[PDB]
Amino acid sequence: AQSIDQLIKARGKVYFGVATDQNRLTTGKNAAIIKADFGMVWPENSMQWDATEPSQGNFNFAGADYLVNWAQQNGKLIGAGCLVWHNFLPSWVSSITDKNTLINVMKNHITTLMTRYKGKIRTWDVVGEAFNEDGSLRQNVFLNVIGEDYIPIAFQTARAADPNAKLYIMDYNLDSASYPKTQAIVNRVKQWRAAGVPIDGIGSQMHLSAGQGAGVLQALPLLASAGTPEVSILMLDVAGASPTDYVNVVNACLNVQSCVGITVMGVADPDSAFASSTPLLFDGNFNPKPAYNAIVQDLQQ
Numbered sequence: 001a002q003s004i005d006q007l008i009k010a011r012g013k014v015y016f017g018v019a020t021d022q023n024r025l026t027t028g029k030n031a032a033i034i035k036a037d038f039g040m041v042w043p044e045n046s047m048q049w050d051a052t053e054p055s056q057g058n059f060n061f062a063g064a065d066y067l068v069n070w071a072q073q074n075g076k077l078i079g080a081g082c083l084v085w086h087n088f089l090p091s092w093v094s095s096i097t098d099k100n101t102l103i104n105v106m107k108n109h110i111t112t113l114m115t116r117y118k119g120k121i122r123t124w125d126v127v128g129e130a131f132n133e134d135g136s137l138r139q140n141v142f143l144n145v146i147g148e149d150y151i152p153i154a155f156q157t158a159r160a161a162d163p164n165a166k167l168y169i170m171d172y173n174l175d176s177a178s179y180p181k182t183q184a185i186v187n188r189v190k191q192w193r194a195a196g197v198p199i200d201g202i203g204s205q206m207h208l209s210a211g212q213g214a215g216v217l218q219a220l221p222l223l224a225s226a227g228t229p230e231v232s233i234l235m236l237d238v239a240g241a242s243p244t245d246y247v248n249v250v251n252a253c254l255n256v257q258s259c260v261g262i263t264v265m266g267v268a269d270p271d272s273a274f275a276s277s278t279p280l281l282f283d284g285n286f287n288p289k290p291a292y293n294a295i296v297q298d299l300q301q
């Protein structure tokens with residue numbers, strides 16, 4: 001067996017996933033590789049705020065429907081996001097200056113997207129990139145205008161929109177247990193859960209430099225100590241694609257009982273935003289790279 005999704009499921013995890021979108025599925029060998037080797041897809045761009053709600057209350061789902069329908073057509077799980085973050089955020093939103101207006105805009109955005117696909121989506125990334133590197137909360141428009149309540153409200157709204165989905169907060173630079181940001185998200189998530197915020201998961205966005213895989217072995221169990229039902233690895237790529245870095249990340253998930261799976265940022269190196277760092281698991285000829293084969297070896301029993 002050569003599918004890393006099949007192999008990780010045979011170790012008891014839920015999926016090995018990949019980010020994609022209509023533009024990828026219509027070209028190259030992406031669809032064929034995803035069908036063969038991955039068990040879950042995420043929309044890279046098509047579910048982000050600027051794509052789905054380019055003006056207030058005016059929604060569009062052309063790309064998102066394409067991806068969701070492709071996943072259902074091909075028997076793949078779906079993760080989607082990000083509902084509330086500063087990236088891909090239209091200026092019409094970040095121009096809002098008052099709490100109630102932004103709350104209602106945010107709630108309508110969450111509810112409309114999640115209701116459209118109710119029951120079909122495994123995981124929603126509800127809040128993203130909410131932390132500064134020092135562990136304080138990032139002064140995005142949601143924090144600046146709503147205040148700290150925005151995170152409780154976002155999660156409570158998402159739970160109502162689709163109670164079947166696993167609701168995640170996600171961030172990057174959570175890759176060392178000694179880094180302030182990693183410690184802060186754990187402390188805040190534990191506080192938020194004790195306050196009744198339904199945070200089901202922490203997702204670690206792992207855009208890694210060479211050699212950073214080893215730190216994840218202790219960072220991931222730190223993240224899991226916040227008490228969420230789940231943790232996951234998102235947006236994974238590694239500059240140089242060292243088998244060692246990738247195997248370390250996989251082993252971290254294997255060693256964390258609440259880690260449900262791993263999502264890689266793309267399929268083939270030339271299509272990565274970081275293509276020249278050759279950071280993915282397939283080369284430009286769509287052949288599996290040494291890191292892919294090292295994952296296969298690590299997961300086979």
Ligand SMILES: O=[N+]([O-])c1ccc2nn[nH]c2c1
Nearest residue numbers: 019081082125234235263265
């Ligand atoms: O894991 N992912 O590659 C991924 C990509 C885009 C997203 N938007 N929200 N969550 C996401 C996860």
